[PDB]
Amino acid sequence: EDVWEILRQAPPSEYERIAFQYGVTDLRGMLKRLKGMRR
């Protein structure tokens, strides 16, 4: 998927954007799981 890697690599401002383009519509998700790491 690389959404893990690229949404821990992309901008944050654009973490929003590119979770929404690079397949993580649940940027909601991406952050909650990024947090499951840092939650």
């Binding site: 929003e16 954007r17 909601r28 952050l31 947090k35």
Partner: protein, 375 residues
């Protein structure tokens, strides 16, 4: 007794209050926003009945106690009841020290500022949470969407609105209000059940009827054709055991209850149905945001749990929207708790403590601070 903290994602869902920790997969607490007054208050050996521990206990042991929402119409008229409600929350099913954990709070649009003012200072004082933050339930569900663009029909707990968006960009001018609520359909269907030879006035009757809805009531894509069917539609006469025990018969009401969300004439609101409210919000939108809106037709609400609701959307728009454009209504199965999920994610936004309503900022800036440049 652990590391830094985890937020307190707490929702004051219009009908039920729901909440969990930061980034929880489900708000661990949910129950009606009722206050209970035992009618006759019989005297017995000892006691054991608290006035208004309603939570989820009261309705089961309902009847004597009446029902009260502090937030009756999405807006709270009493609070003492209500802060004791949150105490029940944080110490009976949250059973936690508010001072321990940060909490994000749900506030609906159009609230007078003083409402969140007080809710804040009271939570600070009584609950002394590390600090708090609040957000629009509509907006929280909107982050729960992740759909940066498009309008959301936030007909969820007990309210209805439209939330036009683009890349997270929503117009307050483009957002309207709908007083319609599960309570409203409640009153309507109770009315109809009564007029059809039934005595439906009692509170527990009120809960029963809402349940009758949530498990029975649907909506028909077509109105007159399905009503002509009901003239002889032998399918729809499913009668349901009245929970007291005698099967209560049901007919076309199983659908023609909520459609009034499109036609408030029978419910008696000059207001226009959900669909055309969405549509006119669309028109006020800019030129080409509207195709996205069609594709971003994100529905929201478990109250909107009815079958064919989305399909009725597409068809009604079609009747309204040009065929040139293509309509795509969204509606997650997880719509009523989607608000709490978005709250959990946002409060969990450990990159986003900075927006947090802390002790000091509040104290030096009093209550007014939370309102200026922040919420």
């Amino acid at each position: 007794d652990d590391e830094e903290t985890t937020a307190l994602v707490c929702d004051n869902g219009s009908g039920l209050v729901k909440a969990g920790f930061a980034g929880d997969d489900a708000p661990r607490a949910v129950f009606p926003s009722i206050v209970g007054r035992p009618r006759h208050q019989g005297v017995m050996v000892g006691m054991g009945q608290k006035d208004s521990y309603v939570g989820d206990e009261a309705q089961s042991k309902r009847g004597i106690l009446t029902l009260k929402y502090p937030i009756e119409h999405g807006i709270i008229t009493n609070w003492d009841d209500m802060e004791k409600i949150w105490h029940h929350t944080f110490y009976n099913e949250l059973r936690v020290a508010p001072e321990e954990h940060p909490t994000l709070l749900t506030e609906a649009p159009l609230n007078p500022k003083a409402n969140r003012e007080k809710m804040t200072q009271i939570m600070f004082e009584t609950f002394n949470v590390p600090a708090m933050y609040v957000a629009i339930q509509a907006v929280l569900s909107l982050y729960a969407s992740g759909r940066t663009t498009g309008i959301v029909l936030d007909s969820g707990d007990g309210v209805t609105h439209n939330v036009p968006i683009y890349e997270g960009y929503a117009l307050p001018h483009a957002i309207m209000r709908l007083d319609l609520a599960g309570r409203d359909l409640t009153d309507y269907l109770m009315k109809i059940l009564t007029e059809r030879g039934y005595s439906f006035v009692t509170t527990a009757e009120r809960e029963i009827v809402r349940d009758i809805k949530e498990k029975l009531c649907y909506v028909a894509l077509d109105f007159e054709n399905e009503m002509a069917t009901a003239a002889s539609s032998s399918s729809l006469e499913k009668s349901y055991e009245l929970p007291d025990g005698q099967v209560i018969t049901i007919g076309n009401e199983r659908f023609r209850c909520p459609e009034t969300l499109f036609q408030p004439s029978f419910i008696g609101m000059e207001s226009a149905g959900i669909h055309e409210t969405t549509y006119n919000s669309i028109m006020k939108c800019d030129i080409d945001i509207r195709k996205d809106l069609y594709a971003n037709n994100v529905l929201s609400g478990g109250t909107t749990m009815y079958p064919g609701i989305a399909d009725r959307m597409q068809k009604e728009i079609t009747a309204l929207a040009p065929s040139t454009m293509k309509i795509k209504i969204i509606a997650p199965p997880e719509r009523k708790y989607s608000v709490w999920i978005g709250g959990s994610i946002l409060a969990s936004l450990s990159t986003f403590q900075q927006m947090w309503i802390s002790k000091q900022e509040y104290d030096e800036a009093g209550p007014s601070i939370v309102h200026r440049k922040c919420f």
